[PDB]
Symmetry: C3
Subunit: 316 residues, 3 copies
Amino acid sequence: MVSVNENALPLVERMIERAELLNVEVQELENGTTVIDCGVEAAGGFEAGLLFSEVCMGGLATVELTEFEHDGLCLPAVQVTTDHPAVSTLAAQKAGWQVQVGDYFAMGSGPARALALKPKETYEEIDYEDDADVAILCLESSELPDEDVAEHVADECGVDPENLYLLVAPTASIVGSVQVSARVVETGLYKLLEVLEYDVTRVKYATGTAPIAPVADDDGEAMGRTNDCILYGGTVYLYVEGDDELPEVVEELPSEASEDYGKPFMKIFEEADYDFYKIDPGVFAPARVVVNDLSTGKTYTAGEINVDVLKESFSL
Amino acid sequence: MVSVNENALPLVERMIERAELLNVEVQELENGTTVIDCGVEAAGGFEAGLLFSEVCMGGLATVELTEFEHDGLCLPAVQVTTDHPAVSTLAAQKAGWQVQVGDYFAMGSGPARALALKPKETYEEIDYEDDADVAILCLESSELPDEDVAEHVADECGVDPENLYLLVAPTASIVGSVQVSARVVETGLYKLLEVLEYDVTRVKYATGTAPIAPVADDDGEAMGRTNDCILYGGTVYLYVEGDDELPEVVEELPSEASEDYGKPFMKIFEEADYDFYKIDPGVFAPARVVVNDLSTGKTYTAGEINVDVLKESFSL
Amino acid sequence: MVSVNENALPLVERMIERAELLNVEVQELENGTTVIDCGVEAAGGFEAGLLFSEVCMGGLATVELTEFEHDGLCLPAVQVTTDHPAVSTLAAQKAGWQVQVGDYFAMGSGPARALALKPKETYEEIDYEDDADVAILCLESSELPDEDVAEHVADECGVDPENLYLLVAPTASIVGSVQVSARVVETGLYKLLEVLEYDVTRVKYATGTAPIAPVADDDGEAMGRTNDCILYGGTVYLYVEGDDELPEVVEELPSEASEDYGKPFMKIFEEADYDFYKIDPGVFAPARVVVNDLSTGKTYTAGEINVDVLKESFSL
């Protein structure tokens, strides 16, 4: 048993202690909730982005900087590694909490979801629930959350608001670029569970890479760019206790297994009438997967990096 | 003077404290010996594999994750760096202790060898012996060692069994794949000393990389795969106080300098009647070496990465 | 506000505590100044080189090992990342202090410059000055500094000599190779400010890579080699609050924008009558730049890695 909230706490404490170094701004709300601004008014940075990503993954993953170089496209990249794949990426990292309090809307991700159980079905499917007296949630938003947003999150997690920590950054920020690319492993795990209905607790180890998107000048375009890093630039290495249907599942895993594949996400979005429900959920996957079946010793691969679409997306 | 056992201890203590996070299982035997299971019953992982490798290298090296990408073969890789090349890789890392107690057999590597002096000739040749009241040994085995194996190791090291730590993983595990690939620098140093009879204390700094093998379904095949990562996928950068015979030595260093080069190790093994003695010891070397002569400023290179043999080995 | 001296101190303390592990030799002078030899008599190493580089950058950057592989040239490389670009690289890292006391000459770099203000113009231009009771300076020299050099540096920084720390390594050492390649980001920032007269406080985040030069057998050749790593092997990713002249500035940023571009620095130096003043200051820049305009979302690129000149430089 590992606690995603307890294992994320030391990283949060480090971010608070090193706030100036990280360009994050920390404030306490009147209910006692600590809000760590990582990109709304604060500048944040690469280091804030890496820690944000690790906090998001429940302290159960390492997220580090590396380089992406393919077909004359060179970018900074993240490298994500976890030995608790389902729990790190799905019990924590997945943005599965739509947080809406009054006039505030934001997608919430990170270990607090494992206390509030958002959504409940995920936790039943992977058989996980956290027991912790602290709650940590990451909010993707262009606005800092006020006291009643904090109160709501703290309440649903069953903790005192003094023991709630909220990390916040917009999509169009360097922390946005880093933290979204860091979910390259997660999107693979989520598609396995939700779309392909595979038992993701079979996935024992995981590591992956994805380029870091050039920061757009608004959150809408940044959503497209950061998604494209995964769909067209992401590679995931999975190590699985496999079965008979593993080879077929691997062929269905990459983003190219979708009919929506081929264009920058912004164009996929536009052609879907700006409606997420009209997009094939199977398109939200890594460009390239390499899967080692631990029970047979075999390796299955599917998908490719698509530098052309990345160049189109970033206007390069 | 650096102690390989004292410098490895903090890493062992970290592994014990973070056992759940690492998927390692720690138990104390009746004589007081601590056994850290990193892959027999415990799952282990990448992080357990990296720490296992660093413990093996006496706390005198950094072993980190990176990526291997050549000719359409992309795998996770290790990057190994040490500023104590002979001591880290030969006084500690080398699997030079055949541990056999009753019905238990295992190859032992790591800093405990520098107390027990296994084999004695290596320590005379590099002029090193550890002085420490703790002993740490890594065992490559499909079975966890019992009390009398621990007692034997503790006795030969001259320490109380309460101050002995045993790390264990099979070849066919992710920790197996990581820790074997991490000896890419070591195999170069060992061949220099043993095969080419070079003074390896001339080697001042070293760094190297090797792909991490897809985990096989048995230890025998895993031995071949993990060896191939070094022989056909390994690159070593050595910085040497050189002499007149340095250029000739470098040409003889890579695995291709052997007549056994060209096929996956499993096939080299089969053609040698499954007898290690009938294999040319010069084949146990990195695919590619780059050697900087610190006294002349010159650089000598030899060997190449062989992606074809790697693909054959992993059935890709 | 971040202090480059206070943030570098913990790294200095780590180097002193782990001196044996790092192959650095620490001594106290009679005025109380601590001198950390990282390559004159001490061997140093990769790890000493990485810490030296981070100390040099005021504890405001991460410098780690990675790999450089282009056109059949494979070398170790550094990866440099900072979220305080102007302060880390210009208030600290830049070798802007010509230290000359008696018969001792050395280029001084690192956070002590932010106390002594060397040169004063840089600190006025970026609006930065450190407030710290400790001073840390890195000296590139083939000789260890004696008491009166230490006294001079301590005096100009306004600190007691007991609170001064001097790190020393020659150009022709592995620490020399590492620490010079680590200024790949710095040379870009310096050219922006000094040559192109751009407001470098607009640069919000930065990351870059450069190969580590094979160590030459004298400091003169090592100067050429280590410079070539940046000029012909360096890539810098900058994230800027841009303006209207950003695209033109980016085209002027790489080393190829200079008429002196094309040959190893040793040959540029020889053709300039061994006079630094006859060399175009614009040639001291990264080979390749990738610049993300944070205000428009656009990315501008200029320059290329030149493996041919690197091979010529290292005689490969």
